[PDB]
């Protein structure tokens, strides 16, 4: 394997590398609902929701996914 503390979309959601849409969705949801600002009471959790999506929105798209699987986010920093 390779060092962690990297941050991968698939991981953020909690799936394997190459998960289909349905899979990405199901998981993404189960999470959002838990980190939702309407369901959750504490912000700490909500703040995460923002991240989760960002990952899903990618794997959800064929261009954003295929590109992420082939190369990946990269050295891109925030």
From Swiss-Prot:
Domain J: from-to ranges: 10-72
Membership in a protein family: Belongs to the DnaJ family. DNAJB12/DNAJB14 subfamily.
Protein name in UniProt: DnaJ homolog subfamily B member 12
Portion of the parent chain present: 110 to 174 of 375
Record's subunit section: Homodimer and homotetramer. Interacts (via J domain) with HSPA8/Hsc70. Forms a multiprotein complex, at least composed of DNAJB12, DNAJB14, HSPA8/Hsc70 and SGTA; interaction with DNAJB14 and HSPA8/Hsc70 is direct.
Annotated compartments: Endoplasmic reticulum membrane; Nucleus membrane
Function: Acts as a co-chaperone with HSPA8/Hsc70; required to promote protein folding and trafficking, prevent aggregation of client proteins, and promote unfolded proteins to endoplasmic reticulum-associated degradation (ERAD) pathway. Acts by determining HSPA8/Hsc70's ATPase and polypeptide-binding activities. Can also act independently of HSPA8/Hsc70: together with DNAJB14, acts as a chaperone that promotes maturation of potassium channels KCND2 and KCNH2 by stabilizing nascent channel subunits and assembling them into tetramers. (Microbial infection) In case of infection by polyomavirus, involved in the virus endoplasmic reticulum membrane penetration and infection.
